[PDB]
């Protein structure tokens, strides 16, 4: 058996501007086993519809997921990614930051 803690990156496809559509990405990678729970949060609340999920095993046997959705940032909305995995003692929250 192998277990490996996910790497978690949260970033937009383009630099952000209010009014302009964009995409918010969670790239969760290098983990094992493949069982995992990954949510995008908007103002602390789970985003139900996350349009896209690209995912696979890597050559090294670990797993990766790109979890993303269209979003239009505003001044006052904060976003984060919440991940749970057997390697984590509690859920891991990674905030989105622009820059």
Residue numbers in the entry: 0 to 98
From the paper:
By calculating the change in the protein intrinsic score upon all the possible single mutations at these seven sites, we suggest that the V85E β 2m variant should reduce the wild-type aggregation propensity, while two alternative specific mutations in the W60G β 2m variant (W60G-Y63W and W60G-N83V) are expected to weakly (the former) or largely (the latter) increase the W60G aggregation propensity. In particular, for the crystal structures here reported of the W60G-Y63W and V85E mutants a closed AB loop conformation was observed; by contrast, the wild-type β 2m, W60G and W60G-N83V 3D structures exhibit an open AB loop conformation. The Y63W mutation triggers just a minor reorientation of the DE loop backbone, but is responsible of extensive, though local, side chain reorganization. Such movement has two consequences: (1) the shift of S55, F56, L54 and F62 side chains away from W63, and (2) the DE loop moves about 2 Å towards residue 63. Conversely, introduction of the Y63W and N83V mutations (added to the W60G mutation) did not vary significantly the Tm value recorded for the W60G mutant.
To determine the molecular origins of these processes, we compare here wild type β 2m and its W60G mutant, to investigate the correlation of thermodynamic stability and conformational flexibility versus aggregation propensity. β 2m is a single-domain protein, characterized by a seven-stranded β -sandwich fold typical of the immunoglobulin domain family; β -strands within the protein are named from A to G. β 2m is the light chain of the major histocompatibility complex (MHC) class I121314. While β 2m is highly stabilized by the interactions within the MHC class I15, when β 2m is released as a monomer, it may turn into the etiological agent of dialysis-related amyloidosis, a condition triggered by renal impairment and the subsequent chronic accumulation of abnormally high concentrations of β 2m in body fluids. β 2m deposits in joints, bones and muscles, lead to movement impairment, bones fragility and articular pain1617. The three β 2m surface mutants that we rationally designed (V85E, W60G-N83V, W60G-Y63W) were produced as recombinant proteins, purified to homogeneity, crystallized, and their structures determined at high resolution (1.75 Å, 1.49 Å, 1.70 Å, for V85E, W60G-Y63W, and W60G-N83V, respectively).
